[PDB]
Design an enzyme around this catalytic site. Sequence first.
Site, PDB file in Angstrom:
ATOM      1  N   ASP A  25       6.218  -1.324  -5.445  1.00 52.10           N
ATOM      2  CA  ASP A  25       6.078  -0.334  -4.379  1.00 52.10           C
ATOM      3  C   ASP A  25       4.612   0.063  -4.194  1.00 52.10           C
ATOM      4  O   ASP A  25       4.115   0.958  -4.884  1.00 52.10           O
ATOM      5  CB  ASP A  25       6.961   0.868  -4.697  1.00 52.10           C
ATOM      6  CG  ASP A  25       7.039   1.864  -3.562  1.00 52.10           C
ATOM      7  OD1 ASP A  25       6.268   1.751  -2.582  1.00 52.10           O
ATOM      8  OD2 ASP A  25       7.895   2.762  -3.635  1.00 52.10           O
ATOM      9  N   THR A  26       3.931  -0.551  -3.212  1.00 56.49           N
ATOM     10  CA  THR A  26       2.533  -0.200  -2.964  1.00 56.49           C
ATOM     11  C   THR A  26       2.363   1.205  -2.377  1.00 56.49           C
ATOM     12  O   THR A  26       1.256   1.742  -2.412  1.00 56.49           O
ATOM     13  CB  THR A  26       1.882  -1.226  -2.034  1.00 56.49           C
ATOM     14  OG1 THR A  26       2.578  -1.240  -0.773  1.00 56.49           O
ATOM     15  CG2 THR A  26       1.920  -2.633  -2.669  1.00 56.49           C
ATOM     16  N   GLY A  27       3.414   1.815  -1.841  1.00 53.70           N
ATOM     17  CA  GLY A  27       3.291   3.174  -1.359  1.00 53.70           C
ATOM     18  C   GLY A  27       3.580   4.238  -2.389  1.00 53.70           C
ATOM     19  O   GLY A  27       3.669   5.422  -2.041  1.00 53.70           O
TER      20      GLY A  27
END
Lengths: 99, 99
Positions: A25-27
Amino acid sequence: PQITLWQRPLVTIKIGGQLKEALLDTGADDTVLEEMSLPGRWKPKMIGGIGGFIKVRQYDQILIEICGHKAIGTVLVGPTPVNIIGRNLLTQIGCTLNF
Amino acid sequence: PQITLWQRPLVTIKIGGQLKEALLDTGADDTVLEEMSLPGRWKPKMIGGIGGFIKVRQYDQILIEICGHKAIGTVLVGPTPVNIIGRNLLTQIGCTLNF
Ligand SMILES: CC(C)CN(C[C@@H](O)[C@H](Cc1cc(F)cc(F)c1)NC(=O)O[C@H]1CCO[C@H]2OCC[C@H]21)S(=O)(=O)c1ccc2nc(NC(C)C)sc2c1
């Protein structure tokens, strides 16, 4: 590996002796795992997302094996609906975004 | 571009004639943007995240320019704290995860 995003980027992890699936999850700034039994000591914490906030237990220097890559860092445990690997661990496995 | 994850993966977008900053978010199925003035018709929808759910307005076939790459698809509008570019648009600009 290289992961395209036509489906959820789910990987197998191993933490605290257990096998789980988790979203890359890059966010997500931090790593948040659903309720599970971790050994160490923890600190109470609150974290914010789309629909508001949840209380979590913070464990530091936890070892996680993410798709065959080892990393140690902070793990947050609490009522997330999805296991999330956040950037504090993604940087350790060398993860990047490419387009 | 190749983007490391030592800081939030923010990009400049153009949507509805306005310039905004948004997070490249592999953990987001859909694109959700903070309250903004968008033209056209829209369907009411409710989506879930870490702390619960939020009602958003769903606009289809919306043009977004993301870091200079054009994409068309569904944009959800509502009380998110950060603008999120989700996988429905990330696949359109060829975005992948690598480690
Ligand atoms: C909103 C974003 C800025 C942060 N969110 C990470 C996103 O990737 C979440 C991850 C997720 C996937 C999921 F399937 C279910 C979830 F509940 C959550 N996606 C998401 O909400 O997606 C929604 C909407 C788009 O459509 C769909 O996508 C799937 C569900 C729908 S976060 O989880 O709230 C988060 C994580 C870590 C973190 N660390 C902190 N540090 C503090 C100290 C500042 S704050 C913080 C907050």
